[PDB]
């Protein structure tokens, strides 16, 4: 019943999880078996938010109580250590109100209560506990967690966990760990309680979290919030959390992401040790060998790949001032009744100038996008160009086919291509020409497909024909220019190029505008040069290609060089830097130090080789540093090169070997 939670709202803290958070992946029993599984697990040596709920008895101190809404994601991990139990449950839901069913878990002194209802969760949920008037023991007063439910869907009860009502001792031995997930519609809950002998942080021991219950609620969960018990403010001191306080407490929280673990099963079927394959190269090689101890040697664990950074698409020159494009702009052209027809694999007209950084709607494409043109083209298409009033091409544009606007110029009923109508003063070569030309409005006889009318048909209909280029409804077929009174006309004079579909013989004919992305050299990128596609590292090539040669090929019949379609410069094609990842380490008993060798890769490309996304403190240290060394077999990191030239201990390659020295 509070509009907004009130408290100090100090910044949160952080702490290391260590090996905590291990749970049994499944109900299967295994004896002395090292089982590897892939499931939502808490990463080893990860950071977990340390929510602080304490009160200091003195003139000044740190007093706060935090219980905000936090994301749920693929999983949630929880822990708590208090002298007396304070966190009495958790809240799970999406909207945290009566607009969606939300799981509610609470605890009391009698039984664990779990219910599913459309609870109207308060902004600062908690349990009202106050000292009894005569019994002198803690007593519940108000269940300030929600205001109304308005719906019931599920209820369950369970025996209470470990009880600690009255605070005693100076230790937080009452440690409780919980894991929550909502995969496949099952709200699986894994938890375990063990004693500890520490006052702060988390224990260094290992203890798997056995499963407790599995609720098939099936409701989607995206948000969660923790709840605790607050004492009356006027009775005891402490931070006023919306007017209430509580005793000393401390709880943590973490998150789980998909990965794989190496679980060790004891003879009794209890998990004793666990190795996180994504913790460090030592753990990775342990997982690869399916053993917790690795003998001295070099083992190929995984493969690294330098994924492309960006996609590059290139094509012939823009082209700027190409003679073929000059025809469309201002030479040897007329209106639709006398458009010019061309087809040649020479260049592309000046309409592609805007297709670099100012791609406006001039490239009118119907049914398909201009980008699809680069990947693939249409069937045989002519090059019909003319001058009309801007968007008047709707009559001839694709889509308006099937004896609807085909009288002036017929096109195939399945005409789904691109029509180019562009004009600019800067992002162009020539300005649009004049549109003063004759036009045909209607005719009686049919017309040949993908062809313009040539018959001089005259229809004696109408009584008051329109006057001028613009006017009321026009009935006369033949007039100086034409416009449809039922559709918008009078747009700006633009020249339009239409790809007259033919769907006969020669495919992959002259196409529409083609993108010309900025060339990238010495950096891995995806390239597409005139249909030819691939990935690699473009670099200047000394190869001297003939004028008619577009790209080269090696003896293996694989592309290894491509002439730049615009600058006519030969660029070598080099495959993305890939190779094996061999972990170099002595016997696990001797030491845990490791050295990573990347086969056939420059040492500078190591950090960008799909690295820098895993645990930085453990992985990045071996992915770079001042000890990086370059050898013929590859790049060696984590080891210091010396000229002593001892006898080989670990085979590296090309006469090099690694050894452990103290």
């Amino acid at each position, epitope marked *: 019943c509070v509009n907004l939670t009130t408290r100090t709202q100090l910044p949160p803290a952080y702490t290391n999880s260590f090996t905590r958070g291990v749970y049994y992946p499944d109900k299967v029993f295994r004896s002395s078996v090292l089982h590897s599984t892939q499931d939502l697990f808490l990463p080893f040596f990860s950071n977990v938010t340390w929510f602080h709920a304490i009160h200091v008895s003195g003139t000044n101190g740190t007093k706060r109580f935090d219980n905000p809404v936090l994301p749920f994601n693929d999983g949630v991990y929880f822990a708590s250590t208090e002298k007396s139990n304070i966190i009495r449950g958790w809240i799970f839901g999406t909207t945290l109100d009566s607009k969606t069913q939300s799981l509610l878990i609470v605890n009391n002194a009698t039984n664990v209560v779990i219910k599913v209802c459309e609870f109207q969760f308060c902004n600062d949920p908690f349990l009202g506990v106050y000292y009894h008037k005569n019994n002198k023991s803690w007593m519940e007063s108000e269940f300030r967690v929600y205001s109304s439910a308005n719906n019931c869907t599920f209820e369950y009860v369970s025996q209470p966990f470990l009880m600690d009502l009255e605070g005693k001792q100076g230790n937080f031995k009452n440690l409780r760990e919980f894991v929550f997930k909502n995969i496949d519609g099952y709200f699986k809950i894994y938890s375990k309680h063990t004693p500890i002998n520490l006052v702060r942080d988390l224990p260094q021991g290992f203890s798997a979290l056995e499963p407790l219950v599995d609720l098939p609620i099936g409701i989607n969960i995206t948000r969660f919030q923790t709840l605790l018990a607050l004492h009356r403010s006027y009775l005891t001191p402490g931070d006023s959390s919306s007017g209430w306080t509580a005793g000393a407490a401390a709880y943590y929280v973490g998150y789980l992401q998909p990965r794989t673990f190496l679980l060790k099963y004891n003879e009794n079927g209890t998990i004793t040790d666990a190795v996180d394959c994504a913790l460090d190269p030592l753990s990775e090689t342990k997982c690869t060998l399916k053993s917790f101890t690795v003998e001295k040697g070099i083992y190929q664990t995984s493969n690294f790949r330098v994924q492309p950074t960006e996609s590059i698409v290139r094509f012939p020159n823009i082209t700027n001032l190409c003679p073929f494009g000059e025809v469309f702009n201002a030479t040897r052209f007329a209106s639709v009744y006398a458009w010019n027809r061309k087809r040649i694999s020479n260049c592309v007209a000046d309409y592609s100038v805007l297709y670099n*950084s*100012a*791609s*406006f*709607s001039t*490239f*009118k*494409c*119907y*049914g*398909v*996008s*201009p*980008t*699809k043109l680069n990947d693939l083209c249409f069937t045989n298409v002519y090059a019909d160009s003319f001058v009309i009033r801007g*968007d*008047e*091409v*709707r009559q001839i*544009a*694709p*889509g308006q086919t099937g004896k609807i606007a085909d009288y002036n110029y017929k096109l195939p009923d399945d005409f*789904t291509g*691109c*029509v180019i109508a562009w004009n600019s003063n800067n992002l162009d070569s020539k300005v649009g020409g004049n549109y003063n030309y004759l036009y045909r409005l209607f005719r009686k006889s049919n017309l040949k497909p993908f062809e313009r009318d040539i018959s001089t048909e005259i229809y004696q209909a109408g009584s008051t024909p329109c006057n001028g280029v613009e006017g009321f409804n026009c009935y006369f077929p033949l007039q100086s220019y034409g416009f449809q009174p*039922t*559709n918008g006309v009078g747009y700006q004079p633009y020249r339009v190029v239409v790809l007259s579909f033919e769907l006969l013989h020669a495919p992959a004919t002259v196409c529409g505008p083609k993108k010309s992305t900025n060339l990238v050299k010495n950096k891995c990128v995806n390239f597409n040069f005139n249909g030819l596609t691939g990935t690699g590292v473009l670099t200047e090539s000394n190869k001297k290609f003939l004028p008619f040669q577009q790209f080269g090929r090696d003896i293996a019949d694989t592309t290894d060089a491509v002439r730049d379609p615009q600058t006519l410069e030969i660029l070598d094609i080099t495959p993305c830097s890939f190779g094996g990842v061999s972990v170099i380490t002595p016997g696990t008993n001797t030491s845990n130090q490791v050295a990573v060798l990347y086969q056939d890769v420059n040492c500078t490309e190591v950090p960008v080789a799909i690295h820098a996304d895993q645990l930085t403190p453990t992985w990045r240290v071996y992915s770079t540093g001042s000890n990086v060394f370059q050898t013929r077999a590859g790049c060696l990191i984590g080891a210091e090169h010396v000229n002593n030239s001892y006898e080989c201990d670990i085979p590296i390659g090309a006469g090099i070997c690694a050894s452990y020295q103290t």
Partner: nanobody
Amino acid sequence: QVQLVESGGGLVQAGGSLRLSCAVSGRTISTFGMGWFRQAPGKEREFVATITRDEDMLLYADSVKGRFTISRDTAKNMVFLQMNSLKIEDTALYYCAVRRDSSWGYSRQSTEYDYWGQGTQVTVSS
């Protein structure tokens, strides 16, 4: 025609922005276009940006200045578009139903439909 689900539509409003959207025929598939052209008599009509099937190119202003349009959803597939500043005056009917054209493209002269159809008669012009 059966009206399609939507999460906000109709006449535009001054200031701010409106996430105009309409349910698409496909489910869990974002490889579709969309058009918001409104047909009505008179000159009180303004061009509306169109989204191609590929979705790589956004609006008539190109992706250089535009923003990604969400076209995938879990509960019900839907397309989200951002509206640029425009005059509040409007007189065309709004009807978020099954689109009469599916061959979406980059054309400008192309419109959702030539004639009008069933829809709300809301008007703030005359």
